[PDB]
Amino acid sequence: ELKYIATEASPAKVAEIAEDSDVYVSEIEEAADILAGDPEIDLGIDVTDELNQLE
Amino acid sequence: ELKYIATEASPAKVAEIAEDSDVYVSEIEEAADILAGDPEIDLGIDVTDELNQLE
């Protein structure tokens, strides 16, 4: 049985499946930040001073 | 009967099956330490000093 555990807790496979998860994690989180990319448009198209009179 | 015990308590086989177990044991235990490999990422990506103000 130690052989059968060591077949499938193989450190050759533990390290594979751990590395794969990390790449997908940074792929998804950065794909959330470009999903919030529009602040760069909002801060750009509106620069309106005039309301300092309104202030 | 001593012959039949000595056929299957053969020291040629006792020493084989004892050596095989030890290799699988170190294979599995080290495959547990690479299963805890992520502390190296946690200690790396977060180094945030600023909270010393918050402290």
Numbering used by the authors:
A (entry chain U), B (entry chain U): 110 to 164
Give the text the authors published on this PDB structure.
The ESCRT machinery mediates membrane remodeling in numerous processes in cells including cell division and nuclear membrane reformation. The identification of ESCRT homologs in Asgard archaea, currently considered the closest prokaryotic relative of eukaryotes, implies a role for ESCRTs in the membrane remodeling processes that occurred during eukaryogenesis. Here we show that Asgard ESCRT-III proteins of the Lokiarcheota self-assemble into helical filaments, a hallmark of the ESCRT system. Notably, the Asgard ESCRT-III subfamily is substantially reduced compared to eukaryotes with only two ESCRT-III proteins (named here CHMP1-3 and CHMP4-7) encoded in some species including Loki and Heimdall archaeota.
Next, we determined the cryo-EM structure of helical CHMP4-7 tubes in the presence of CHMP1–3 and DNA at a resolution of 3.6 Å. We were able to determine the structure of 36 nm PspA-like rods at a global resolution of 3.6 Å and a local resolution ranging from 3.0 Å at the inner rod wall to 6.0 Å at the outer tube wall. The rods are arranged by helical symmetry with 1.05 Å rise and 173.9° rotation. Thus we, relied on the strong density to build a model for Loki CHMP4-7 α1–5 into the density, while no density was found for helices α0 and α6. CHMP1-3 is, therefore, not a regular member of the symmetric rod assemblies while it may be part of the curved filaments, involved in nucleation or occasionally bound to the rod assemblies. The structured elements of CHMP4-7 adopt the canonical ESCRT-III fold: α1–3 form an extended hairpin, connected to α4 via a short linker (E117-P120 Fig. 5B, inset). Helix α4 is separated in two parts by a short loop at G146 and connected to α5 by an extended linker (I154-E159). The monomers are arranged in a j + 4 repeat, where α5 of chain j packs perpendicularly against the tip of the hairpin of j + 4, forming the typical ESCRT-III assembly motif known from IST1/CHMP1B. In the assembly, helices α1-4 make up the wall of the rods, while α5 together with the tip of the α1 + 2 hairpin forms the spikes on the outside of the wall. In CHMP4-7 rods of Asgard, α5 only interacts with a single hairpin at the bottom end, which is a common feature in eukaryotic ESCRT-III assemblies, while in bacteria top and bottom ends of α5 are interacting with two hairpins connecting two layers of the assembly (bottom). Therefore, the Loki CHMP4-7 assembly more closely resembles the bacterial configuration with the characteristic spike, while the Loki CHMP4-7 monomer adopts a conformation closer to previously determined eukaryotic structures including the α1/2-α5 interaction motif.
